[PDB]
Amino acid sequence: SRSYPCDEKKQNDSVIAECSNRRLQEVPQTVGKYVTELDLSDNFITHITNESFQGLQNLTKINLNHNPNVGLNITDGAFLNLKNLRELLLEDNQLPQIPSGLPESLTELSLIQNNIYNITKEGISRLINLKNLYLAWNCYFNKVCEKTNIEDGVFETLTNLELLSLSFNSLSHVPPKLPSSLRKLFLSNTQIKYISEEDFKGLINLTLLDLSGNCPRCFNAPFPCVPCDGGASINIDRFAFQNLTQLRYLNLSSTSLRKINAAWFKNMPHLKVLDLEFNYLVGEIASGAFLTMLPRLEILDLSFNYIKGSYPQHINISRNFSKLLSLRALHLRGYVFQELREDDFQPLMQLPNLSTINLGINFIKQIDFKLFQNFSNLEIIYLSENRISPLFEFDPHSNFYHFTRPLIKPQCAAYGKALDLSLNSIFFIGPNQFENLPDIACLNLSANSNAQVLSGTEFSAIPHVKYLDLTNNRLDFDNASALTELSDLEVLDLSYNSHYFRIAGVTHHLEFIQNFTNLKVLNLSHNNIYTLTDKYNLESKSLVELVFSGNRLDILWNDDDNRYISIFKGLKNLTRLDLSLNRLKHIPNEAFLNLPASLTELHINDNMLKFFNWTLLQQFPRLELLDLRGNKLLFLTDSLSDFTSSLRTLLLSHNRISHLPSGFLSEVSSLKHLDLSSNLLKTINKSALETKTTTKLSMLELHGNPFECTCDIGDFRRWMDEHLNVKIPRLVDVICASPGDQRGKSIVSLE
Amino acid sequence: SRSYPCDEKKQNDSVIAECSNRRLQEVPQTVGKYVTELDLSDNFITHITNESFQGLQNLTKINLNHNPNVGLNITDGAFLNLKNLRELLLEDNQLPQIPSGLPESLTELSLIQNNIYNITKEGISRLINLKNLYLAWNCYFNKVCEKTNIEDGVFETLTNLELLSLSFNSLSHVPPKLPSSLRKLFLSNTQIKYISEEDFKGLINLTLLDLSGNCPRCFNAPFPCVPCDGGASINIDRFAFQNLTQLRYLNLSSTSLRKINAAWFKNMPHLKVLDLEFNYLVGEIASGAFLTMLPRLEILDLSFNYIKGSYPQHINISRNFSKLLSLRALHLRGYVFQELREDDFQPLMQLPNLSTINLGINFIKQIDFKLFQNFSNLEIIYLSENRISPLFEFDPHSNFYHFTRPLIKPQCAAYGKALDLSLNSIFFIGPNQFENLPDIACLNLSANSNAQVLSGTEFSAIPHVKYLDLTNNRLDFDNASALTELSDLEVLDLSYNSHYFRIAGVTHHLEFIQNFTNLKVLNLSHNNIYTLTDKYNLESKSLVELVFSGNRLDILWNDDDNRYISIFKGLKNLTRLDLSLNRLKHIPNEAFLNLPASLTELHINDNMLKFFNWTLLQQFPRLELLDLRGNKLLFLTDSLSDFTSSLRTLLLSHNRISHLPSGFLSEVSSLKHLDLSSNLLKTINKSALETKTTTKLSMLELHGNPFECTCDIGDFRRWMDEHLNVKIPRLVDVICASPGDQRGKSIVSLE
Ligand SMILES: *[C@@H]1O[C@H](CO)[C@@H](O[C@@H]2O[C@H](CO)[C@@H](O[C@@H]3O[C@H](CO[C@H]4O[C@H](CO)[C@@H](O)[C@H](O)[C@@H]4O)[C@@H](O)[C@H](O[C@H]4O[C@H](CO)[C@@H](O)[C@H](O)[C@@H]4O)[C@@H]3O)[C@H](O)[C@H]2NC(C)=O)[C@H](O)[C@H]1NC(C)=O
Ligand SMILES: *[C@@H]1O[C@H](CO)[C@@H](O[C@@H]2O[C@H](CO)[C@@H](O[C@@H]3O[C@H](CO[C@H]4O[C@H](CO)[C@@H](O)[C@H](O)[C@@H]4O)[C@@H](O)[C@H](O[C@H]4O[C@H](CO)[C@@H](O)[C@H](O)[C@@H]4O)[C@@H]3O)[C@H](O)[C@H]2NC(C)=O)[C@H](O)[C@H]1NC(C)=O
Ligand SMILES: *[C@@H]1O[C@H](CO)[C@@H](O[C@@H]2O[C@H](CO)[C@@H](O[C@@H]3O[C@H](CO[C@H]4O[C@H](CO)[C@@H](O)[C@H](O)[C@@H]4O)[C@@H](O)[C@H](O[C@H]4O[C@H](CO)[C@@H](O)[C@H](O)[C@@H]4O)[C@@H]3O)[C@H](O)[C@H]2NC(C)=O)[C@H](O)[C@H]1NC(C)=O
Ligand SMILES: *[C@@H]1O[C@H](CO)[C@@H](O[C@@H]2O[C@H](CO)[C@@H](O[C@@H]3O[C@H](CO[C@H]4O[C@H](CO)[C@@H](O)[C@H](O)[C@@H]4O)[C@@H](O)[C@H](O[C@H]4O[C@H](CO)[C@@H](O)[C@H](O)[C@@H]4O)[C@@H]3O)[C@H](O)[C@H]2NC(C)=O)[C@H](O)[C@H]1NC(C)=O
Ligand SMILES: *[C@@H]1O[C@H](CO)[C@@H](O[C@@H]2O[C@H](CO)[C@@H](O[C@@H]3O[C@H](CO)[C@@H](O)[C@H](O)[C@@H]3O)[C@H](O)[C@H]2NC(C)=O)[C@H](O)[C@H]1NC(C)=O
Ligand SMILES: *[C@@H]1O[C@H](CO)[C@@H](O[C@@H]2O[C@H](CO)[C@@H](O[C@@H]3O[C@H](CO)[C@@H](O)[C@H](O)[C@@H]3O)[C@H](O)[C@H]2NC(C)=O)[C@H](O)[C@H]1NC(C)=O
Ligand SMILES: CCOCc1nc2c(N)nc3ccccc3c2n1CC(C)(C)O
Ligand SMILES: CCOCc1nc2c(N)nc3ccccc3c2n1CC(C)(C)O
Ligand SMILES: *[C@@H]1O[C@H](CO)[C@@H](O)[C@H](O)[C@H]1NC(C)=O
Ligand SMILES: *[C@@H]1O[C@H](CO)[C@@H](O)[C@H](O)[C@H]1NC(C)=O
Ligand SMILES: *[C@@H]1O[C@H](CO)[C@@H](O)[C@H](O)[C@H]1NC(C)=O
Ligand SMILES: *[C@@H]1O[C@H](CO)[C@@H](O)[C@H](O)[C@H]1NC(C)=O
């Protein structure tokens, strides 16, 4: 009753099977007949008939995507026997045609990233229960392909269809006779140079229209890009939008617009979000009649509208921006101006809800920072990637014109008002740098090439910063009072400040750490710390988490040196310590005993450790997680039960362990998750995993071990059959290296 | 007659065996009896008896360093049977004593890095042929160890001894009764507070004396450091040096000297190198009477004399520096001053021979650069690691107080006068930055945080730069005219300028490359180049070498994009191309065929390639070296000789190849060096390696293949004996992965 090759899961009272990435050459017939969802994606399967899915009654969803990995053949009516089938995902299979004989039970069908140039009534019209249909990315860029032929009224007969995506195919015309049920319609990069009055008429319900990339703006495009003749603007009929009163989302990005007709929006009182990126809008941003027509708009994206070859002193914002009442986020990137003056943003200052200004990639040399104060609600000021100084490669499921991730890390933003100045030129913070700013809880100074010695006065004008990102500078920590003006500081990120730490001759002072009452998280990673001046110890009463990865503890804890022996002992509250990537061959016993006893989580992974003294765990009563992955360890104690009562998770993967000690797990009742994968194990003995008392072990990962498949391994199989409460993942990757005839086979199949 | 386990090399008409790092548990009995030198270092050997070396007549040299790797037991008289044994290297063996009954034939004995606390007549005084004796690093730092007992008169009887190294042991006094034949005496870090008149009295042959680290300067020490009481200076009697008239080299580093007694040098006409580092000499550097005593001095190291807690405006250089008329290099690092004024260096400007001035690590904010022109001979101006703005962990065989590597890369300095500005704050190069400089052939701007768009005017004042290091900046290459003012430019390093390259939205211009008539070497590595503006090709008629590693050719050569297909074709002179670390899964055939036909050397290593089209090698008539290492490749052609006339070296290591096709070594007469190491080969059939016609192959690397050890290998073993002209290195590392009873065995030992 151990599921193979697939893994069985429990989700919303329905059990699902994950067969993905298992190197399968066909549809496994061992799939449990009770499964409602089946993921076959990323395998070698070359064929599908009506015999593949047999016996599966309740199956509602099948993922066949990315098959074969590195010419999928589907028969006519291969899916026909499946009555309960809802969602079918065929993406990236090199299908020359829409498969015929698809069931009429389909509510969702994704053919994305295939060779299909023909949308036919024969394959489509019969399925009337379709909600979502994904045809995108069949013909695009420099791919060898044909123009998409859409047979007349192929879509007319799906009267339930709420979503249609034809994006990234050669179309040249909006398809006629679209069902009035359409909610979202994606026409992006379809080569449609003209939008008529007739095109969208029947759609009274449209929530979203994507016309983007038709007559694109092609200068400096990171994809093969073909403009309309002379680089003309897309032609939109004055009345093209008259009948869309429900539109929430309009994507006009990269349509080469020099002009917005305000009457496009006349009939769109509720428009939420308008994507205007990659057009020529500098003229419209300055005048902009259409901005009077957008009272409910929450998100405006004007990014990359810059005039080629122009570096203007200031950005010209129309007073009519003040008419955008509901505006939440304003995105202006790639406008390209020299200087931000307080009076240039005047139209934005009265807007009640505007929480976000995105000025990224403007090459801005200077900003009058007092201007953000005069706004009302700003929670996010994103200045990243400017010149501010002191004083298939494309994911088909992603937005094509910008990244969709948060501008600021959620963990920083959740503290309060956020100012992101990262990837700029502020190499020295003077006395007046932060004056007349709002009360900033979240500050990103990352990547400023800052070489200064922070003296304790630099942040006085913004004392309430909780989260400070100083990463990727060259900071010189020469002052014990550094940063201590921020008394409320919770998270401090010092990563990638290695510049001065690497020099033995200059002085290094980390003592300021102890001066914070509320400091919770400190990241010291990749600083190359091997030496400190006069004070060898880190000390904090508050600190919870310390990331020390990417430093040299191999030097600090060198056998001939007593000085750093207590380096972490003074962090009295510490529950999480990351020692990874320290080049550690061995940790001196006394050094390990000096780690804080409060630790619940300890990462020693990705070092060179040949040696671990397990006895020392006796001094860490709270330790739930020990991560030893990526070391050289050849040996396991047999005594672990007397070393720890607390250890829940033990990660040993990618080590040299050749053997599992008799009664390895005897009496260790704490241990839930043991990862033995990617080791030297030849086999596992009877007495190895046997215990008389209770055990909560729920997961054991053996994959990547060179098991000897002779009868010696029989007992382990018998252990596996006896305990099914212990989950063993990727059974297909648990593989017999010997005997010669068993090579490549899974250890779960044997005489 | 294939040598095992050692590899036997021919050196200066003699024969040496390299046995190092072979995991040998004891001394091999198979060593050729004609070998003059034997390196057993870094093995597991735990025992040396008089039966270990039997049969070896002419052995002059034995290296036992680092055994066992992670207590070497040497029996009394073990080495006695070796009459011709001269050099014995016993380093890092944890020897508790000097091994008794060593041969009287020893000229050189190295006991460095052991546990020996007693130097006795029994172990030493009988070796009267000793020239070099190394006892260093036995007791030092926080190591648990004993003060060194040196038995009275122990060295007295060694009348040929020219080199004695006692450094890093606790001595407390110079040993009495040293032989007058001494040339070089190393007493560093021996805890000697006082040097009397008697200590060196009779050594009239001494050319080198090292007293460094005695009464050390401990502030900011990156090792456990114990100062003399009160941090006081070493006490050197006025007459301590009076008889050493031959002294060339004196190391006084870190002796805590406040004052230098000029009479120390009264009798030292030959003194060439003086090391004064890590003392408190700022006063002496200003006054400097002792300088008059050193007109023959070539090298003076004053580095790290800074006064604690002091950041003076100017360096104060005594007029008496003008007296050093033989000075070649002056090292003043870590003096710590703000500004370098032309007058400050006056005393140096008439020194005829001074070619090197080292100003590293002073935190200098500004220099008046015109001063360097008043000098006479300056070839090396080292300004690295300053504040300049726009206008066991210790190697026992290395210098303890500074790196000995060249200040400037020799490839760069060879061109002429060098200015090294690396690791400063020059973030913008203005019109006057480089005015009044000498004719600078070699310029290092690395790690200056420079974000500018170089327009072609920045270097005009130093138009003759041959070698330009721009690495580790954030350069915005926005101008086709960049650098073109340097018309004689030969080597250009742009590595780690990825900042703006990684942003798709900004413009990227590499066209400037073509404007150089003499450009030879170009490093573009780790720039993350995935997109360029309007001009997709790199073109030069001059270029010989191009390093493209760490870029994205996976993106540039993506299937759906034809734009970069010719990217390297326009480099018509190119013989060397590095395509490593481009994340390549495969290379489009036409993209490959557009690689310059002139290539003699091509590196595709460390990509993701599963496919290589060998046929395409036809278009590369000059290709000697193909580097495929670190890929996923499963497949070799059996037709290879059809595709290449020229291929000398083929590196296949770390790939997926499990099989060698029949009749390969047939007809390929060009291939001397083939590396198949770290592949999946189970065996090699007869059929693989046969050829009728000649085969020039001189090396074949098999290590790391899971070899099958049945009689099916006997075919290959047969081949190996029948060709001794093909050397297979690391034979101990060519190891059978089956049968289970044959595991770990080298393939070279079997029935
Ligand atoms: C022009 O502008 C318009 C409007 O801004 C863009 O429309 C958006 O397009 C993107 C990308 O195609 C859509 O993003 C995707 O949304 C999918 C829909 O998810 C819905 O349902 C799920 C679950 O039922 C909900 O969680 C979710 O809230 C939605 O209600 C998601 O399924 C996608 O997620 C998957 O892919 C991403 C990326 O790989 C992964 O991160 C996820 O884990 C997951 O695997 C994705 O988020 C977006 O929905 C569209 N907006 C609207 C309103 O529908 C156009 O793309 C744009 N044109 C171009 C060419 O840029
Ligand atoms: C310097 O070091 C600091 C401190 O570690 C780093 O900052 C932390 O980075 C880690 C990731 O490395 C963050 O941990 C992750 O947080 C994500 C945020 O989740 C929030 O919201 C979700 C719901 O969406 C909640 O579940 C969650 O409680 C949070 O409220 C999580 O999504 C992540 O969980 C996933 O990944 C981890 C493994 O990475 C799994 O264990 C989880 O099961 C799950 O799969 C993860 O927990 C952490 O939040 C950061 N902390 C802070 C203070 O910001 C810096 O990144 C580092 N700096 C540099 C340069 O590296
Ligand atoms: C105080 O100052 C004095 C004077 O500067 C220093 O004396 C020097 O000390 C260093 C390190 O001990 C010596 O450097 C080593 O010299 C060895 C001897 O080489 C001689 O013979 C070989 C051929 O047999 C020639 O190649 C060479 O030119 C010499 O004639 C070298 O063998 C060493 O190189 C080996 O080790 C290094 C480091 O591991 C490797 O990089 C090399 O590849 C090689 O494996 C090494 O170069 C130096 O010779 C001394 N100078 C003199 C004139 O004797 C003191 O070190 C200093 N005190 C302290 C504590 O720093
Ligand atoms: C950007 O890219 C450039 C161009 O590749 C890099 O600069 C080159 O880097 C390599 C080092 O990787 C240099 O090649 C090496 O040259 C050494 C110089 O030796 C000189 O002098 C000796 C005599 O003392 C002569 O034998 C020789 O002809 C030279 O004149 C050699 O010692 C090296 O040989 C050793 O290593 C190589 C493998 O690396 C082996 O093939 C050899 O057998 C031997 O073991 C090596 O050949 C090259 O000279 C540099 N060129 C220039 C123009 O400087 C940059 O480093 C790179 N930038 C960055 C930041 O990475
Ligand atoms: C301060 O600003 C810097 C620079 O803008 C921010 O660094 C950026 O952080 C983002 C989000 O974490 C990174 O994006 C992510 O990269 C990872 C790893 O490849 C990927 O898994 C995610 O999906 C996402 O793409 C981005 O790489 C990084 N940029 C650089 C150049 O460092 C930083 O996050 C900011 N700090 C705060 C507190 O927000
Ligand atoms: C310009 O200045 C920079 C910075 O000072 C120089 O970079 C430095 O180059 C040296 C010499 O190659 C590097 O040291 C070497 O490191 C290797 C690898 O670890 C080691 O095997 C060698 O023994 C040697 O010590 C050093 O890492 C590097 N420093 C930094 C911070 O990047 C550069 O060489 C200069 N360019 C020229 C033309 O001189
Ligand atoms: C040779 C190095 O001597 C120690 C040192 N370390 C630093 C440092 N990390 N930063 C500095 C910044 C400005 C001025 C001096 C220093 C400095 N200094 C110089 C001094 C102020 C005398 O300590
Ligand atoms: C969103 C930016 O689009 C193109 C661009 N690329 C760069 C660049 N690599 N560098 C710049 C430096 C100074 C001023 C402008 C630019 C610039 N610019 C701006 C502009 C001058 C309009 O091209
Ligand atoms: C401002 O936002 C709130 C919700 O956050 C909403 O109730 C209100 O309608 C918004 N005001 C405007 C002018 O849209
Ligand atoms: C830190 O810097 C401030 C300002 O330079 C200074 O007043 C204070 O003395 C410094 N503290 C130290 C050196 O620990
Ligand atoms: C210890 O850590 C916890 C968790 O963050 C925190 O609530 C508590 O205040 C800390 N103790 C001290 C002394 O700051
Ligand atoms: C492990 O540490 C203990 C101290 O609890 C010590 O007695 C023992 O020697 C250590 N074991 C090894 C193998 O070093």
Ligand SMILES: *[C@@H]1O[C@H](CO)[C@@H](O)[C@H](O)[C@H]1NC(C)=O
């Ligand atoms: C030193 O310089 C003078 C000329 O300034 C030159 O004649 C002499 O040859 C040089 N000496 C050495 C040893 O290079």
Ligand SMILES: *[C@@H]1O[C@H](CO)[C@@H](O)[C@H](O)[C@H]1NC(C)=O
């Ligand atoms: C490069 O810069 C120079 C100097 O500013 C300018 O004259 C020239 O037009 C620029 N060339 C370009 C933009 O390619």
Ligand SMILES: *[C@@H]1O[C@H](CO)[C@@H](O)[C@H](O)[C@H]1NC(C)=O
């Ligand atoms: C081609 O390379 C060789 C070797 O560097 C060089 O001599 C020659 O000048 C180069 N050709 C041109 C056109 O510069």
Ligand SMILES: *[C@@H]1O[C@H](CO)[C@@H](O)[C@H](O)[C@H]1NC(C)=O
């Ligand atoms: C190898 O390249 C040649 C072009 O000369 C092409 O005909 C052949 O199909 C290629 N082989 C493969 C497997 O792509």
